[model samples]
Target: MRLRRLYCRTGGFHLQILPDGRVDGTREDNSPYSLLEIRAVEVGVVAIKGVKSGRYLAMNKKGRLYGSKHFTDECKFKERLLENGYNTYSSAKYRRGWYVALNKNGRPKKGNRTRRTQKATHFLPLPVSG
Candidate 1:
């Protein structure tokens, strides 16, 4: 039987798969955290593999719905800003500055923007320890 080993990195986690069907996670220091053993399945080969091909697949298929919605919202906002006499570059700069200010202290100051972004005022209470 042929086995394929793969490595995947997601959300600060590194996963490694061994040829013998073992999976493990670890920090960058090569120290293992957890291990899992499973049977490996073989898949058919691909004809061509390249960065351009992967990017094309992601943008055209994986991101089709979500990317469309995001860009549509952005275009609507830009049009509204232009109608209100806010130039494209100026509006973009203002939005970037606003994001920086909001994320600076992990909380926003008193303002409409803060209220709009942060609906909940109080932080969630931690669980009690015995």
Candidate 2:
């Protein structure tokens, strides 16, 4: 099995995950920030639906949600995805968004976000198999 890892730092929380599916962290309840990890391939269907319906949230390099803007249309949504190494394409039933998080130099960003906003701002890329 191939595994991917992600890390995230939010306002006051830190989270780390390993490819073996082990998660470690201090996620305090009622806290404004926290980290989350999920199997991309397993949740692809839900992800697609969220993105197309404008229910997804976008995050910055620091794993902070974009407090200044909301994804209200296709163009804005696509731009945010591309910045994070994602590409959007349409299919028979929905528009599929694919991507891997990247750093400043175009390397994969190795972490998850610190907090989930009141709304989901971004869609995580669904894993692809070659």
Candidate 3:
């Protein structure tokens, strides 16, 4: 319903989008780079876009996270709400259990190395005023 921040509970970092079309995590509150638009592509699928960078969040076939300039299958994410009240995002196109995650140092982690059970894969979609 509004711009949201994907706050990673592992490191308390908000998913950030860089101007150069890169994705990472940041602890900075109210940063434009941390602003995201989550769009429902299907019943349990979504597309995440950077409000500031104008890029789409994508996970490739190799299970890596990046920002895509155009919307594609890689940009589609399967949204799952965990029992712990957090969310997990997996690649809708390559759903081999690869998830979008971040490291403790506010860095993006390889999707293949992440799992829904991992704390790094958990996120809170906190809304921010547009």
Candidate 4:
């Protein structure tokens, strides 16, 4: 599916998977990292991929999420559209409370440190056109 730039609610930064396989939150606007694709496997469940990196966002057994070169089961996530006009993503199989979150400075945060109410745990998926 055609996904949008997953922007941070606080700083308007982006969830970026670099070509070097580095997954980071960045402030670089309109960069390749800002472009993303969400593939829906089921209702509310999906996998995020970097449009330019050709990689998927994956969470490992150790709780480290990275840009996976190949799409795997760990790449799946349960994306919840919250009432506050943001989305929260949890591991579809591994973790329940842990979310895909970034700090105010566009840095990835520990999943364990995330909460549903915090802005760091929220994202705005801006719509895009092909």
Candidate 5:
């Protein structure tokens, strides 16, 4: 992903799915994902809804990543902070260790093929710039 670490604060968080599909971390605060809202839905899960695009970061059972126009089950994710400090997000229902991840190109990676050790599946949440 061309996008770099971000400046963020409490009460809410933001992120970008860089790739056209199956990944995030886009470069240059571009449209379609200039600051995807990270909101809580429940424990260990949150919604990554595009504030500008209005599409939800989602994964299908087929292991493909895409944006959902409507809020639905496919939009939920299982998030966790690994020992390495980078946060990892996997689909709550599609649990085959598939995480919401981005490659260096700023594209989404296939959830099913993604593993925790890979850098492409990792994201570093930066503190809000003061």
Candidate 6:
């Protein structure tokens, strides 16, 4: 399957992985760290990983986003496609409604500050060109 890049609607940035394994957003697309491998763990559940960093995007119990070296329960997310054509990812193991989000500064927003209707929580998946 082809890779995908998630474009955060609020920051106008693509979800990217840092060398330190931190999750953030950036305007750059030339870096391969922004490309992601999405695997379905179950119906409507997905695991997102950075193609370059080899880190899994995970949300913790504190509503914080981080990159885990190995796939774990924290790495699972409930993928939902909204009617507005945007997508949302909520922690499958943590409290419900804790979503993956990025601020306007391209920083990861604490999941507790995110809402399903917030622009920061909306992302559009862009198909990467080979």
RMSD, every candidate, angstroms: 19.7, 13.6, 1.3, 1.8, 6.4, 1.2
Task: Give the per-residue Cα lDDT of candidate 3 at 60.
Answer: 88
Q: What lDDT would candidate 1 get against the real structure? A: 0.20
Q: What TM-score fits each model? A: 0.16, 0.20, 0.95, 0.90, 0.74, 0.95
RMSD from true fold, candidate 3: 1.3
Candidate 1 C-alpha lDDT tens digits along 15-61: 23223222233335342221221121212111111111121000111
- Each model's total of backbone clashes: 0, 12, 0, 0, 14, 0
lDDT of each: 0.20, 0.26, 0.89, 0.80, 0.63, 0.89
Residue 69, model 3, lDDT: 88
| Poorest lDDT segment (10 consecutive residues) of candidate 3 | 26-35
Tens-place lDDT digits, model 6, residues 33-72: 8889888899999999998899999998899888898989
Worst 10 residues of 4 by lDDT: 103-112
**Per-residue lDDT over 26-88 for candidate 4, one digit per residue giving the tens place of the 0 to 100 score:** 886668765888878889898899988998888776666688999888899999999888898
Q: Report the error of model 1 at residue 23, Å.
A: 0.8
Ranked candidates (lDDT, high to low): 6, 3, 4, 5, 2, 1
Against the correct fold, how does model 4 do in TM-score?
0.90
Q: Output the lDDT of residue 99, model 4.
A: 78
* Candidate 5 per-residue C-alpha lDDT over 1-130 given as tens digits, one digit per residue, 9 for 90 to 100: 3223422221122345443433344445333554466766999897776655667778899877787877888899877787877777788878799976655455566877788777666665542231
Instruction: State in Å the error of residue 18, model 1.
Output: 5.6
Q: Over all chains combined, what TM-score does candidate 2 have?
A: 0.20
List runs of model 6 lying over 4 Å from the truth: none
Cα lDDT, model 1, residue 122? 18
- Candidate 6 minimal-lDDT segment of 10 residues: 10-19
CA lDDT, candidate 2, residue 91:
18
Candidate 3 achieves a global lDDT of 0.89
